[PDB]
Amino acid sequence: MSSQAWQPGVAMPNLYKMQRMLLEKCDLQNYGDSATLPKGIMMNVAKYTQLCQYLNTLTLAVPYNMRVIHFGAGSDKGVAPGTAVLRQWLPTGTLLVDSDLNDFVSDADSTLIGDCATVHTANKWDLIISDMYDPKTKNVTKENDSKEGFFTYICGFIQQKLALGGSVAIKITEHSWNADLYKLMGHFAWWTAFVTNVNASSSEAFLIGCNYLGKPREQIDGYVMHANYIFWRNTNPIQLSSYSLFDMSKFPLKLRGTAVMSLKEGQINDMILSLLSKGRLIIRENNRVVISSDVLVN
């Protein structure tokens, strides 16, 4: 604690992942506190920056002509702050597609408006980002159960549309979470729940899968693991810090020029899996990027 204040945020410690806990209500000590952001900086710009600052510390395949898709990109201000950061963070020439349920203005290469379930793409993707949050989640009516809707879409999209070696970051909260998505984290070389230092007073975290392996290396119970996450958040107060926002010197994503290779699922071996896990390899087709959004007529 407070040593972390100089970090972009705090990741859920491995020991907490290995527990088996019962889901309790999340009560944060720092609830109501606010970090002091630089003059004129939006919370969501600060938030996305720290997320990227953390992602810089992981092993991410960063191929030429990288493909990145961003769900829940629009704000109530009608702009896309998070997309702008991703744009800044990603290597120039990276294809960035973003989407939201509501209309917004974006700096992305292409933007799709509508429910995420209406979104289809031909090709696969190197990096997937989701800030999607259901405003109705704020209703505490029932108990806390695994959630569906866009969460169901994301799990499917990951399995079908994510390249091997690819990585994801999916925003969750106490009440906005899904069990299969946790289970799906075991299909990655590594995974964590990351909490930004600026938003540390919130149950918000990003589920980060690292280097998608397409098959489970680890078996995970989604209900148990989410209970583990809440337990971690409950017993570990995080000090709100805007500190890391002030050094942007090393911020840009280093371009690894990671290799891209098209293989059948039978050609994949422990030597290949090794390369994937180290973020030295991407497996997908190199074709052009084609997306679409289904429109209902009535």
């Binding site: 630089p38 004129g40 900086i41 939006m42 710009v45 600060a46 920056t49 704000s75 201000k77 009608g78 702009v79 896309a80 702050p81 997309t83 702008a84 950061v85 744009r87 800044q88 120039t92 209309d103 203005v105 974006s106 700096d107 992305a108 290469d109 926002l245 942007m248 010197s249 911020f251 840009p252």
Partner: protein
């Protein structure tokens, strides 16, 4: 023969004492950058703030066509450097000012050409 002129519309709205367009996206950067007007990555220097291009484009923000046969937008997808003193109205600035072709800086701000 009719086309709406938004450029004039906003300028007069401003001159009328109207509140400038807000929620332009300001980027975190080093402020050691080259200071050029429109760039691929935030280039702001000590005197500048860097913004996301699309949020500073009047035509983008107002959901209207862009003024050119191609309808091309030279802001969106890029970043724009606004002098810190003018940063309360980035849209107004980009509208009223002009980028020097040879040195790539703002004409009247940082252009020695």
């Amino acid at each position: 023969a009719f086309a709406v002129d938004a450029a004039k519309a906003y300028k007069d709205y401003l001159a009328s004492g109207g509140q400038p367009i807000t929620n332009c996206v300001k980027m975190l950067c080093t402020h050691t950058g080259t200071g050029q007007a429109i760039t691929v990555t935030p280039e702001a220097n000590m005197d500048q703030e860097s913004f996301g291009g699309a949020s500073c484009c009047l035509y983008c923000r107002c959901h209207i066509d862009h003024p050119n046969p191609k309808g091309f937008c030279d802001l969106k997808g890029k970043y724009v450097q606004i002098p810190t003193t003018c940063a309360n109205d980035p849209v107004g600035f980009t509208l009223k000012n002009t980028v020097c072709t040879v040195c790539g800086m703002w004409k009247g701000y940082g252009c020695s050409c």
